[PDB]
Amino acid sequence: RLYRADSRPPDEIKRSGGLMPRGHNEYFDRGTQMNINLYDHARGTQTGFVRYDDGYVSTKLSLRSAHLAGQSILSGYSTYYIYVIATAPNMFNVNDVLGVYSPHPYEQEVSALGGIPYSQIYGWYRVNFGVIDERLHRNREYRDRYYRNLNIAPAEDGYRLAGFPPDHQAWREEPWIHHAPQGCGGDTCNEETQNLSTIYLREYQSKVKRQIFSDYQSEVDIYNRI
Amino acid sequence: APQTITELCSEYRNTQIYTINDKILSYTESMAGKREMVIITFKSGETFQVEVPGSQHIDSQKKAIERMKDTLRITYLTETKIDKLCVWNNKTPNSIAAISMKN
Amino acid sequence: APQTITELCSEYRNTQIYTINDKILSYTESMAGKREMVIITFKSGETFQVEVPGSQHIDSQKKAIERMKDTLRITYLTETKIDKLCVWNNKTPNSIAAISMKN
Amino acid sequence: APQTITELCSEYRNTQIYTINDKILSYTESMAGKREMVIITFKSGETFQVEVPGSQHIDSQKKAIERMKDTLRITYLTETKIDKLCVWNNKTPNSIAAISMKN
Amino acid sequence: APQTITELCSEYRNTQIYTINDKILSYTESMAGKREMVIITFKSGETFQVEVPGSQHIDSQKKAIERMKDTLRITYLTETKIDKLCVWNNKTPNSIAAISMKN
Amino acid sequence: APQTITELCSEYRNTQIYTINDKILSYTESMAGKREMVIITFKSGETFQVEVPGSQHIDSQKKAIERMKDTLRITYLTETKIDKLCVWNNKTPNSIAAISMKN
Ligand SMILES: OC[C@H]1O[C@@H](O[C@H]2[C@H](O)[C@@H](O)[C@H](O)O[C@@H]2CO)[C@H](O)[C@@H](O)[C@H]1O
Ligand SMILES: OC[C@H]1O[C@@H](O[C@H]2[C@H](O)[C@@H](O)[C@H](O)O[C@@H]2CO)[C@H](O)[C@@H](O)[C@H]1O
Ligand SMILES: OC[C@H]1O[C@@H](O[C@H]2[C@H](O)[C@@H](O)[C@H](O)O[C@@H]2CO)[C@H](O)[C@@H](O)[C@H]1O
Ligand SMILES: OC[C@H]1O[C@@H](O[C@H]2[C@H](O)[C@@H](O)[C@H](O)O[C@@H]2CO)[C@H](O)[C@@H](O)[C@H]1O
Numbered sequence A: 001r002l003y004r005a006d007s008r009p010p011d012e013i014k015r016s017g018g019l020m021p022r023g024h025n026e027y028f029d030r031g032t033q034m035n036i037n038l039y040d041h042a043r044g045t046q047t048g049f050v051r052y053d054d055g056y057v058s059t060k061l062s063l064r065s066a067h068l069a070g071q072s073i074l075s076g077y078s079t080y081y082i083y084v085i086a087t088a089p090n091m092f093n094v095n096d097v098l099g100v101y102s103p104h105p106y107e108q109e110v111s112a113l114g115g116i117p118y119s120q121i122y123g124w125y126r127v128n129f130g131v132i133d134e135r136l137h138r139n140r141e142y143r144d145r146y147y148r149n150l151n152i153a154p155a156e157d158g159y160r161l162a163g164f165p166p167d168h169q170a171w172r173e174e175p176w177i178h179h180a181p182q183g184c185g186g187d188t189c190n191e192e193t194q195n196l197s198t199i200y201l202r203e204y205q206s207k208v209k210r211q212i213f214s215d216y217q218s219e220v221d222i223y224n225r226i
Numbered sequence B, C, D, E, F: 001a002p003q004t005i006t007e008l009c010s011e012y013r014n015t016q017i018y019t020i021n022d023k024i025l026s027y028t029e030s031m032a033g034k035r036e037m038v039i040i041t042f043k044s045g046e047t048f049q050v051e052v053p054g055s056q057h058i059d060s061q062k063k064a065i066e067r068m069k070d071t072l073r074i075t076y077l078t079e080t081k082i083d084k085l086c087v088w089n090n091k092t093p094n095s096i097a098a099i100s101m102k103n
């Protein structure tokens, strides 16, 4: 399970289809297409929000760490939540993919590319005046069977998504060298990171639609209709 | 055969294409006698219907009327964007003849 | 043709509109002889049924009754909000004639 | 008509109500000749079937039998909790007459 | 029987395999008389149809044409990639004979 | 009636149980004449078919065949693990008689 302190409440998260990155209204919105880059995301800090810019939403490896971060950033909120999230291949360990270039190593964040769909959120705790209400509220729409057996995406699948700039030494070394986008290590490098990141996201989103939209499939009596 | 909804729409009299490019706002289904139909609306104000089967329908359209109602229900429930609608405009609300969606 | 559920509901004798604006609380389906029906209830305690097909049903209603039961099962399983119901209030539980959903 | 599964169940002989309150553990479907049926089990050890259509089923039940198997498949896939089952106990495994689900 | 779509495709005259490996870009469904069909297109620029039922279709194909249409709708809605298509190339747009998906 | 897929399987000749415990890797559907069928394969290499309705099928099997293809399409889409399959092994690819799923 991964954890994230967030001032955005359960019904809003539900309206949005999940915990979205900065400036992404709905999870399946293709119109207001976001910029995705792991390196950029991992460096940019936010005020009033735990890291959620550049197409990724950050999360921590424990409730306590999630809590500590919440206290530092959300200190002036009478109430806020800490969402409990299931592991799945849309999540990347920031330390592993960026390696020795991981800007905030000590924080040990695991980021979700494109946001976190509502069905991947197990539950949440409410935090009142900075104190955690130890009662876990469970999400009714969590897909237990599906997420039961999934895990973070291994680092090898993230190297090509690292997002380092074209002349960044990392593109000339193990193990990023064997995964550098066309034109990395010219804007093209950048434009290629965006292209590959959008592809990975689109494929994951299809997996989610296969789960949630299938609930609405109604079978037909063909012989009776024919 | 035609290759687009616009081209297909053009072969019939009393039709018109509407570019909706939006999801369905409301879905109404009815099993009341002589009103076995579906009605959909959009936030733009437009309202369309799948007509009750009748004499204006050839036998081959009967199975298609049922498919269309299946499609509109799942399209409404999934909040899927509709691109265009080919409708007969000699009916109130306008009657759906074809629908298209694009990703 | 009608353009809304209220407008359709008014064309019949012995009907009434229930504004639900909530998801279904329980769903009951039966295949027991002579009682092949569906019953749904809400948090408000209101209870409704989709009647067993009968002689009060015109042939065109038979396919619409099966569709309504399909729609109710889907709505129940996905916790989809129902906006309004048009029911025949001369039956116990009140019989469903039309359903509408929104947003 | 009956308003709850318990009322409905009481109208038949050799029936019993089982309070399950759990999701289906396993789902089995067969298209083998003379064994076209569905079998479900629960973690507590209970096993039930939807019977192969036969002489004991009237015309109106034929369709409801097909609907019940559709309901059990989708209920299994979505991991939906089943509240109660009304079953005929004069068959092994016990045969499903009605199903109830809540929340 | 054939074990792959390629093997099955080669058993017919005027067919050919297209390797798409991509999700459906647009979905078009029509219930208009004599044009009860579905048309799909891919980003590649290719357009395919499921033909209006006719005399070139044997009785056993009627149930399969309907199923194919249900399959294409759900594949479109879920953005599931189609791997290969076996199509009849003597029709415009090319007519779908079989479809395969992977992963 | 049988209580498990293994009991049911053993009631027929030329059958065999396969323990899969994996999801469907590929799904092939065909509407081509005399080849109206579905073919599935697993990562382990096995390939199975739902055969074309024929003289070896009793009438009650006509509808069960359609249900099985529906089940195979939806379990492939949802990536649901299949536990066991009971198949007729006197056919190539082996023919599906029953399927079981558990979680
Ligand atoms: O088919 C639905 C559609 O019917 C039109 O009526 C046509 C009819 O389809 C055609 O067979 C006949 O030859 O001409 C009619 C027009 O005069 C309706 O006009 C249209 O509103 C739909 O209801
Ligand atoms: O259509 C279902 C509905 O029927 C009403 O009865 C009607 C019937 O539909 C109509 O054909 C006849 O002309 O008048 C009947 C008046 O009794 C029931 O009244 C209603 O509760 C439903 O069962
Ligand atoms: O309807 C399924 C149910 O049928 C019972 O058989 C009934 C039969 O349907 C009825 O026509 C007759 O008058 O009485 C029989 C016994 O009550 C089966 O006994 C039961 O197990 C189910 O199969
Ligand atoms: O079945 C759809 C398919 O039919 C072809 O027509 C075949 C026909 O299937 C066969 O029965 C007949 O004997 O030969 C025809 C070829 O001349 C169509 O050509 C093909 O385009 C599809 O429509």
Ligand SMILES: OC[C@H]1O[C@@H](O[C@H]2[C@H](O)[C@@H](O)[C@H](O)O[C@@H]2CO)[C@H](O)[C@@H](O)[C@H]1O
Residues within 6 Å of the ligand: D032, D033, F014, F051, F055, F056, F057, F058, F061, F088, F090, F091, F095
């Ligand atoms: O039911 C499909 C199954 O049929 C077997 O063939 C049998 C059939 O089961 C029964 O009617 C009788 O024994 O004769 C049939 C042969 O005409 C097939 O062998 C098996 O492969 C399946 O196809």
